[PDB]
């Protein structure tokens, strides 16, 4: 699917999930054993960084809008990374538009 896949967070392997049902959409990374859990509210993300397709690394960082908070995820298969990046692009763009509409109004 396009909402889950294996990911590495802080050198810990786990499953990254994109929760769209609960507003605002939040990204949850859960360690394999469940000892570690991380959650980021996508309303806070400003830009979405991603390593180029011409590099052996498969990282994907979500910089937080304001020492701004930064969340970096490393993937295993690029297809999973692309399918996760594509869904994130929609959420970040939409929330950026919402902020633009709110500030303008």
Q: Which residues bind another protein (CB under 8 A)?
A: 5-6, 11-15, 23-24, 31-36, 47-52, 55-59, 61, 70, 72, 76-77, 79-80, 85, 89-90, 93-95, 97-98, 101-102
Provide the minimum distance between the beta carbon of 74 and another protein in the complex, in angstroms, as a whole number. Answer: 9
Pick between residue 1 and residue 66 the one whose CB is nearest to another protein. 1
C-alpha angle 30/35/38, rounded to 5°?
A: 40
38 near 9, Cβ under 8 Å?
yes
Provide the minimum distance between the beta carbon of 80 and another protein in the complex, in angstroms, as a whole number. Answer: 6
Task: Provide φ and ψ at 56, rounded to 5°.
Answer: -70, -20
Provide the minimum distance between the beta carbon of 3 and another protein in the complex, in angstroms, as a whole number. Answer: 14
Pick between residue 66 and residue 102 the one whose CB is nearest to another protein. 102
91/105 Cα distance (integer angstroms): 21
Pick between residue 47 and residue 65 the one whose CB is nearest to another protein. 47
Q: Among 104, 97, 18, which Cα is nearest to 60's? A: 18
Displacement of CA 43 from its chain's centroid (Å): 11
């Amino acid at each position: 699917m396009s909402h889950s896949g294996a990911a590495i967070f802080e050198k810990v392997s786990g499953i990254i999930a994109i929760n769209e049902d609960v507003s605002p959409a939040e990204l949850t990374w859960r360690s394999t054993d469940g000892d570690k859990v991380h959650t980021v509210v996508l309303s806070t993300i400003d830009k979405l960084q991603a390593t180029p397709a011409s590099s052996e690394k498969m990282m994907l960082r979500l910089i937080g809008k304001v020492k701004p908070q930064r969340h970096m995820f490393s993937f295993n298969n690029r297809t999973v990374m692309d399918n996760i990046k594509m869904t994130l692009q929609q959420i970040i763009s939409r929330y950026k538009d919402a902020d633009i509409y709110e500030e303008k109004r």
